[PDB]
Nucleic acid binder design. Sequence first.
RNA 1: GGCUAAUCCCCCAUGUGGACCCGCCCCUUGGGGUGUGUCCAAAGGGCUUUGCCCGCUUCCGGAUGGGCCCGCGUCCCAUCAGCUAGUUGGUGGGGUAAUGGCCCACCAAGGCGACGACGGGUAGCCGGUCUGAGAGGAUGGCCGGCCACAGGGGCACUGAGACACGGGCCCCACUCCUACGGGAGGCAGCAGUUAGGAAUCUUCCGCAAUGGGCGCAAGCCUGACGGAGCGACGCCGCUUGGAGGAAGAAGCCCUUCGGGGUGUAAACUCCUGAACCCGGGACGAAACCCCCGACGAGGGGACUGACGGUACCGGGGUAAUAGCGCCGGCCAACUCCGUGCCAGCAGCCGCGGUAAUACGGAGGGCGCGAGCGUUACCCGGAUUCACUGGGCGUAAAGGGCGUGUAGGCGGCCUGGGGCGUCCCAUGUGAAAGACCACGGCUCAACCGUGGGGGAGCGUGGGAUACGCUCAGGCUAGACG
RNA 2: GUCAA
RNA 3: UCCCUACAAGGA
Lengths: 83, 99, 138, 104, 208, 124
Amino acid sequence: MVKIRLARFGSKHNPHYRIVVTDARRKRDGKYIEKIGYYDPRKTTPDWLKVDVERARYWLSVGAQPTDTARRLLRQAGVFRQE
Amino acid sequence: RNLSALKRHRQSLKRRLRNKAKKSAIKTLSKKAIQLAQEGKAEEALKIMRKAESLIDKAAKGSTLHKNAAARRKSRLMRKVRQLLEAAGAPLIGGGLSA
Amino acid sequence: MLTDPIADMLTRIRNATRVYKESTDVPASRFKEEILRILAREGFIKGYERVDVDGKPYLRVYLKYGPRRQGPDPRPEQVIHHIRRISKPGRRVYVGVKEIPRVRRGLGIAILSTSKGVLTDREARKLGVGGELICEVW
Amino acid sequence: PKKVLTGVVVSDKMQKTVTVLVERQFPHPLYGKVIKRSKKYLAHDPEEKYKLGDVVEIIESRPISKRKRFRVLRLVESGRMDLVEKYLIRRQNYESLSKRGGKA
Amino acid sequence: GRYIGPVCRLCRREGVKLYLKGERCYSPKCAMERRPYPPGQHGQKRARRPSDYAVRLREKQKLRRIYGISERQFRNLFEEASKKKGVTGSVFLGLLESRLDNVVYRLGFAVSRRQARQLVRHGHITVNGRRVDLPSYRVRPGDEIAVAEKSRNLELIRQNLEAMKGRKVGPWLSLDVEGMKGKFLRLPDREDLALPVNEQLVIEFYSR
Amino acid sequence: PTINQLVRKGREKVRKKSKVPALKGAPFRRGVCTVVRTVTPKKPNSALRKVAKVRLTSGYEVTAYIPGEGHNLQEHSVVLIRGGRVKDLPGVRYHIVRGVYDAAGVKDRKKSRSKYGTKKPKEA
RNA sequence: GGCUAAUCCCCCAUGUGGACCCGCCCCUUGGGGUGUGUCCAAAGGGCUUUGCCCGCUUCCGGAUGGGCCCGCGUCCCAUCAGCUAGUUGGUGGGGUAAUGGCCCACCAAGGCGACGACGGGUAGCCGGUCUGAGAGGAUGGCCGGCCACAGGGGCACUGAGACACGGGCCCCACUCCUACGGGAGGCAGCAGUUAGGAAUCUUCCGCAAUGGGCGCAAGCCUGACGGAGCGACGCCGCUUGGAGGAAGAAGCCCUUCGGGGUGUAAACUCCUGAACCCGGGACGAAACCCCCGACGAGGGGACUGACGGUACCGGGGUAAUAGCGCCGGCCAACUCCGUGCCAGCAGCCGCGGUAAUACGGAGGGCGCGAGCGUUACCCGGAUUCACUGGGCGUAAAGGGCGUGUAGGCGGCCUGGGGCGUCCCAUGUGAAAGACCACGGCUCAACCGUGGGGGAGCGUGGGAUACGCUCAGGCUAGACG
RNA sequence: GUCAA
RNA sequence: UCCCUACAAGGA
Ligand SMILES: [K+]
Ligand SMILES: [K+]
Ligand SMILES: [K+]
Ligand SMILES: [K+]
Ligand SMILES: [K+]
Ligand SMILES: [K+]
Ligand SMILES: [K+]
Ligand SMILES: [K+]
Ligand SMILES: [K+]
Ligand SMILES: [K+]
Ligand SMILES: [K+]
Ligand SMILES: [Mg+2]
Ligand SMILES: [Mg+2]
Ligand SMILES: [Mg+2]
Ligand SMILES: [Mg+2]
Ligand SMILES: [Mg+2]
Ligand SMILES: [Mg+2]
Ligand SMILES: [Mg+2]
Ligand SMILES: [Mg+2]
Ligand SMILES: [Mg+2]
Ligand SMILES: [Mg+2]
Ligand SMILES: [Mg+2]
Ligand SMILES: [Mg+2]
Ligand SMILES: [Mg+2]
Ligand SMILES: [Mg+2]
Ligand SMILES: [Mg+2]
Ligand SMILES: [Mg+2]
Ligand SMILES: [Mg+2]
Ligand SMILES: [Mg+2]
Ligand SMILES: [Mg+2]
Ligand SMILES: [Mg+2]
Ligand SMILES: [Mg+2]
Ligand SMILES: [Mg+2]
Ligand SMILES: [Mg+2]
Ligand SMILES: [Mg+2]
Ligand SMILES: [Mg+2]
Ligand SMILES: [Mg+2]
Ligand SMILES: [Mg+2]
Ligand SMILES: [Mg+2]
Ligand SMILES: [Mg+2]
Ligand SMILES: [Mg+2]
Ligand SMILES: [Mg+2]
Ligand SMILES: [Mg+2]
Ligand SMILES: [Mg+2]
Ligand SMILES: [Mg+2]
Ligand SMILES: [Mg+2]
Ligand SMILES: [Mg+2]
Ligand SMILES: [Mg+2]
Ligand SMILES: [Mg+2]
Ligand SMILES: [Mg+2]
Ligand SMILES: [Mg+2]
Ligand SMILES: [Mg+2]
Ligand SMILES: [Mg+2]
Ligand SMILES: [Mg+2]
Ligand SMILES: [Mg+2]
Ligand SMILES: [Mg+2]
Ligand SMILES: [Mg+2]
Ligand SMILES: [Mg+2]
Ligand SMILES: [Mg+2]
Ligand SMILES: [Mg+2]
Ligand SMILES: [Mg+2]
Ligand SMILES: [Mg+2]
Ligand SMILES: [Mg+2]
Ligand SMILES: [Mg+2]
Ligand SMILES: [Mg+2]
Ligand SMILES: [Mg+2]
Ligand SMILES: [Mg+2]
Ligand SMILES: [Mg+2]
Ligand SMILES: [Mg+2]
Ligand SMILES: [Mg+2]
Ligand SMILES: [Mg+2]
Ligand SMILES: [Zn+2]
């Protein structure tokens, strides 16, 4: 089914993923459906994690299934908080 | 050599045969129906027509003839039968053709 | 029959000026007149006016020139140095507002015919419209 | 939106089918000059309703046959053999080119 | 690598004194004193009217030979300058003048440019307190160029910063002699520089 | 020509002909020597120019020049052609590369050494 | 041949509903609703085992993916001009998820072509890339998208999906096994061998990260991928030293034999200190899981690093790679000797036949520098296929002349339409790239984030000067 | 007869 | 080789 996962966009030893919505079957760095975030696993910037929290919701709402790592980042950005 | 996932081939054969079989039936009864319908044997032809209907939808339950393919078959049959019957005798067994 | 009455006029004017004529006639047409209107406004010509050479409508175009000059060949400068037909029958040229050309950093002009009427490049530009780029002049 | 094209009927020699000639003018990609090309469309006429010389609207349609993908929307005006003529003449010229030519 | 060879032989070819050694190019001997003519067996013969080309080339050579940069690096900066807004001539100059190895020299931490180079390569220098060993590092306005804490005791650095006592410094540069630290205030104006080079001819040399 | 004409016929892009059918327009093509003849220059010049008839791997047989003073080529020498004609000998359009295969590199060459394929001598 | 389990196969029931025929209604190509008739459902398993979890069935919808159709665009030859029988259309069938000569039966005799059909040659197409002031020319490796193929040809089965690269069947070629009847096989997956060639690499490490498949999970598989290896192949960074030092060593090169040059260059003094040696030593990795809470939100805890003892930090510390092309003009850089139309140079012009700045060597010089040259190819300069931007009296170029077909072009006035043309709004123009800005690796190359663009096409609205078209009129063109 | 000057 | 002029030729 469609997914929300990480696409590799950094460079050798300089990873930078794009939190993405794409068909599970597509190659990972291939044509995604929508960019909904980005993550710098090495926090080399105070902005190593950003998520279109609304947009995430949208897709989750229509079946998007997140990778475990993707889900993790989504939680961190408060995509699942209720209060 | 030796990729145990040639198990898929064995299955395909079993499946193939299982499919091939249901279809043969379908055809034979269908023909049978349009035949009797074409001979004015209303009650008899509708009787068989229903079998064919049933057998078709059943075929559609699984991969056999699954789909609108079933629908098409049913349609095309209830077509020929009702026409051939209109070309002479009234629908007795009320088979499946509606009022 | 003239193949292109506009080029014809533009030319009569080009020719006449080179032998420094005072006026010069041209078979009249409203469109043709509309062009003269600009020529006049812009001060390339003294002006024009209808007339009837043999009971047929023409347009006297009174030409302007510079002052007599110094040494050999005291012929005055031309007010209308350049005047070239652009869009032609057999190759019409149309331009969108963002493509109206800038004739000689402004020292010159371009006459386009637009649905809002015949205008100079600045006018057309100001009025936000394009059209058939008729001819340039400077 | 299904394309709607306007053209003239040049042929009704087909059962329920008329050939509609359609022109379009436009700037030449490099030379500017407005050039004018054309194309024939085989449109569907189930009622045989339209005739030779009719100017009609053609509309994008579900395939009716290999080669037939348009239906005759409506009659715009009719009786323009002039357009038919041109086409016919232009066609006449053809068989007057190759080693099989003929008239002057 | 850098040039690495007879340096005052260039002052000679360009007919104009360049300060490749800085010091000594002040003595009664930058050679520009004795034999201020081109190097080689013909350095004294009658010069021949140089070609429009010859002229621009020589002029570019001079400019680049001053900062002792490679033609490759040189050219790349120039291209960067063209693309950039503002007068290529001046901007190009600002950029050359922004090379750290250069600034170090401008602040006197070292006598010549070549020396100021080695001072960066050998870690003796610091931008905003962080060590930086790239001659080509681009110093920006605000950045403070200091002497490496651990090397503030080198005999060489002593004398050099000592001599800077009471010495003046470029308008775009500030210099606290005690704390052995300076500051790139702004990019220099063509006006601020006094180079024996008509940068205009260079822009030409590359437009060919 | 009129625009109409240009519309009808348009300009014609003309393609250039290769001066080096060393096929596959490769940069070099290998071959073997048929003849290791000698030739006389054209008009203004006069001398005994060295040449070679070469059977190419490109299934071609052409004459190639032998740059340099030295020269050790015989009727079966495997050699590498590099393209580049000799303006003095009509019909010679490729030079032989000295330093590759059976083509010895010019000896005692101290200047333009890279061309002529001559390794650096030990300075001493 | 015999036995047997199931989420395997079948029958009966239940009919939310759905399928089909006929009718009616709305809607308009086969969309939606309704009535009668007929037909069609299912699978169980796990526990923290009586109530939760994984799953099953029928249907409506979402989402993602995709099939099919249409306008426009997409190389060279007219020394290819006529092409066509499933050919073009029809009716009725078959087929499919679905339209369609897609296929078939029968009827009609059509369809296409100079706006280039048919034939021949060449070729995966695009985002883009190179070049250019631009218009344009050339191009399509890497990366992303689409297509096609999996030794050559054909075919279908299974399935949501294939006519399936590591599935199946037959024919052909080839290799191999063979007890000669008959079998096995397909690297255009990674790595590697061999052949061809001017030429293109490791039979490496790992599953730690991202991603994929199956599984409740633990986890398994993953030559996808993350890394390391080899090659100046490319781009970027860096080193071979820094300061001082003679009216100037020696050698070598010149010489008017007075001297000039190599040159502060070396030697030598002082200084720093690439390499190397000690020590410390990482981000990338926090999830899945587990406990609390409710298997949710939320909180707490544990495990995991190929790269690698690598990066980076600190201590110590040696003065230690320079080459290649060129110096007649174009084009920066000159003298001696050798040679004597020879040996040879040569991109074009050209140079060598006794004093050659052009050959070969040396000294000197210029250019660039871990590179420098060469060859090949592309754009440029080339307004030298000219649209921007050219020409044809004598330079290449007016057809021997005419008639007239298609086509291109069309005087003056008014009106309608609004096709061309212009304007507004709106959709589209994926990412990467390109441009600007800020930012992360000490810089940069490289990379991240953000911003600005855009022609073309679709849609709605508008304008009407010019062109077009329709309607009427005029007489200056034409004809009588 | 040929190259050059 | 020489004569011829740097050669072709011709000449010893
Ligand atoms: K669905
Ligand atoms: K679709
Ligand atoms: K292309
Ligand atoms: K292109
Ligand atoms: K260290
Ligand atoms: K040393
Ligand atoms: K020389
Ligand atoms: K070129
Ligand atoms: K002629
Ligand atoms: K003729
Ligand atoms: K009107
Ligand atoms: Mg299995
Ligand atoms: Mg049977
Ligand atoms: Mg004119
Ligand atoms: Mg003029
Ligand atoms: Mg008809
Ligand atoms: Mg049909
Ligand atoms: Mg600039
Ligand atoms: Mg052109
Ligand atoms: Mg000669
Ligand atoms: Mg049995
Ligand atoms: Mg079942
Ligand atoms: Mg119900
Ligand atoms: Mg049942
Ligand atoms: Mg049908
Ligand atoms: Mg059907
Ligand atoms: Mg067909
Ligand atoms: Mg056409
Ligand atoms: Mg063809
Ligand atoms: Mg091909
Ligand atoms: Mg150009
Ligand atoms: Mg194939
Ligand atoms: Mg095949
Ligand atoms: Mg193969
Ligand atoms: Mg095969
Ligand atoms: Mg199936
Ligand atoms: Mg297959
Ligand atoms: Mg394989
Ligand atoms: Mg080989
Ligand atoms: Mg590799
Ligand atoms: Mg993994
Ligand atoms: Mg995983
Ligand atoms: Mg395995
Ligand atoms: Mg890899
Ligand atoms: Mg290589
Ligand atoms: Mg020194
Ligand atoms: Mg794990
Ligand atoms: Mg020179
Ligand atoms: Mg000799
Ligand atoms: Mg040479
Ligand atoms: Mg480098
Ligand atoms: Mg051109
Ligand atoms: Mg040419
Ligand atoms: Mg032109
Ligand atoms: Mg010309
Ligand atoms: Mg002549
Ligand atoms: Mg002539
Ligand atoms: Mg004539
Ligand atoms: Mg005509
Ligand atoms: Mg008109
Ligand atoms: Mg017309
Ligand atoms: Mg009108
Ligand atoms: Mg319109
Ligand atoms: Mg737009
Ligand atoms: Mg946008
Ligand atoms: Mg984009
Ligand atoms: Mg930075
Ligand atoms: Mg960006
Ligand atoms: Mg519109
Ligand atoms: Mg003779
Ligand atoms: Mg000669
Ligand atoms: Zn000096």
